[PDB]
């Protein structure tokens, strides 16, 4: 059983600062990991320490950044990674570590459930909507809703009279910590010059509602 | 770098294999571990040295290694299978653990669906806020995995691009897109701007023109 404990959202530029919680003993003679998940990405292994080294060794590309650390009476391993920014967003993953350096076996046997950091330097900020604008049977024709913060927002079409042939994409989250979303609506080509489109913009927590016509 | 095919897929019943290429001071030296991760829990450990499984893991599962590259087997896939695979290996030039790209493994489903992508150009009135953001958008896809390349005059975009993973219709097919934003300088200043999105090994493009 293992078990992180983090603050969940934590500054730019701040510590983080989490635990992983190891009942049942055992710490001592063992090699302990962190590891991290940036959402949507691939696992990065952070460091690992020994249980009585107390020896550390870290990913050479975070090392001015990373603390491990072991607290054999509390049971508890640490990590501390300075410096934060958008990038150290990701669940936080401590795992047992099986490390025999005589057969170059490095491995992960026993892992945590996880915590998601957030390191957002984004505050509340209302989105700019701009109109997204073009043999074929379909055209499509949508609206940008851009650079707001946080989720969500939502988008009808000709004030919700329109609803066939609408996609809402999901946002993207920007290395600035804004997100941006399209909504696009198919049509079939003849219908290109004899109906209007409006899409309806609504961002709620920045009190802001656009309607934009798309030609 | 530990590189894997970003997407393998077969029916249910068929088996696979999912390669892990690495170098001499990582797998032609370590012994390789594997990974599973079902979406979206924590991952679990597979397999570890190189062909051993740990208890609890069926034997439709197998590794193996051969000089610099290894490669996970499974046989009799089951939808349970479908999750994201990836590869361990110690370095002992770097002194680091070196993950894989990571591999979505996909128990069709229904059948492979190629990308409709759209690129939209920048707005006039964007445009006037001396900004230009493209938007491209990428749609019903099958396998949920594509890699996506930005071009500006034909060259390799690397600064500006932002790109969202993958994620499910309602239709189980899969949408995606990417942005990228520029001044409208930058716009101005080129000829072209491409899309460029590639889906099981074959690559669907869109070019706009200021
Ligand atoms: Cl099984
Ligand atoms: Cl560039
Ligand atoms: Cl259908």
Redesign the interface.
Known sequence: QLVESGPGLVKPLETLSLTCAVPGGSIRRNYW?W?RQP??K????IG?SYGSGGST?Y??SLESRVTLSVDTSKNLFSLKLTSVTAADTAVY?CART??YYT????????????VLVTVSSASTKGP?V?????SESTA?L?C?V?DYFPEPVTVSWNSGSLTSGV?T???????SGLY???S?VTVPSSSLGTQTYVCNVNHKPSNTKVDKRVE | VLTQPPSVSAAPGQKVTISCSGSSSNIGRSYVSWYQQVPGAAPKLLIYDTNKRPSGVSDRFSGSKSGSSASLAITGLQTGDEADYYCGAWDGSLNVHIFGSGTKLTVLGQPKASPLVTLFPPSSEELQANKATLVCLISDFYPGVVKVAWKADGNSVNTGVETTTPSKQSNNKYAASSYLSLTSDQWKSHKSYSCQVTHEGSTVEKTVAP
């Open positions: 990991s590891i959402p949507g691939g696992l990065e292994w690992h060794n990913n050479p993953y099986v490390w057969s170059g076996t490095h491995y992960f046997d026993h892992w945590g459930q996880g700019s701009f109109p997204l604008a073009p499509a949508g940008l851009k996609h994409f999901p946002a993207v989250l920007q290395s941006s979303l399209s696009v």
